[PDB]
Amino acid sequence: GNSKSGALSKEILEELQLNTKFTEEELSSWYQSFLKECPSGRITRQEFQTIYSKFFPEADPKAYAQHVFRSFDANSDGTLDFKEYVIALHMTSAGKTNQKLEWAFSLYDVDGNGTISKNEVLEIVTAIFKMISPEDTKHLPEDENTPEKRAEKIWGFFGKKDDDKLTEKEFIEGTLANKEILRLIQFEPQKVKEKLKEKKL
Numbered sequence: 001g002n003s004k005s006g007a008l009s010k011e012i013l014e015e016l017q018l019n020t021k022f023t024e025e026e027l028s029s030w031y032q033s034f035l036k037e038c039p040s041g042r043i044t045r046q047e048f049q050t051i052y053s054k055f056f057p058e059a060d061p062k063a064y065a066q067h068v069f070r071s072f073d074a075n076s077d078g079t080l081d082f083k084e085y086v087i088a089l090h091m092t093s094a095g096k097t098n099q100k101l102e103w104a105f106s107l108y109d110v111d112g113n114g115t116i117s118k119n120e121v122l123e124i125v126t127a128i129f130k131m132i133s134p135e136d137t138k139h140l141p142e143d144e145n146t147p148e149k150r151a152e153k154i155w156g157f158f159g160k161k162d163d164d165k166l167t168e169k170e171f172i173e174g175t176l177a178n179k180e181i182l183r184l185i186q187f188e189p190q191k192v193k194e195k196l197k198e199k200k201l
């Protein structure tokens with residue numbers, strides 16, 4: 001930790017790699033500031049939720065923030081340490097999606113039982129949908145303009161029956177190969193929005 005706490009930034013860089021938006025020295029600085037506000041270096045789910053409530057005033061981010069917080073162990077109780085908190089912000093707001101597919105699986109596997117069910121896709125798709133301001137949902141395709149439609153389209157693209165289980169192997173294959181699945185599972189609010197106002201006539 002430099003010798004006086006701080007080498008937690010190495011673990012972060014390792015687990016995030018090129019995806020990092022920070023050097024270890026900057027992470028330590030953010031960490032020093034983090035500790036002035038959260039002395040224990042831990043952050044609860046309620047506190048994490050507040051971050052998103054504050055920075056997404058146009059949306060209803062509570063469910064979304066809770067699922068993101070849980071992705072780091074499928075637990076609503078407890079806390080996230082600085083490392084998981086930095087990685088969580090990166091997953092929702094920075095970098096490329098294709099480097100986040102393994103984490104995306106953990107996000108979609110709500111109960112953490114190793115596979116994704118149809119209902120879990122709907123729960124997450126709904127949470128992400130609520131991150132879109134009412135103003136933008138009108139630019140959304142007819143067959144992708146409600147949580148139900150989006151979630152069923154994703155399930156259909158995976159060629160699944162109502163009670164089938166979706167594995168990580170297939171989730172990664174499909175999110176990489178089929179760009180429509182990518183578009184529909186997309187969890188970064190800005191990316192959903194920016195594609196939600198582009199394309200072609």
Ligand SMILES: [Ca+2]
Nearest residue numbers: 109111113115
């Ligand atoms: Ca599951």
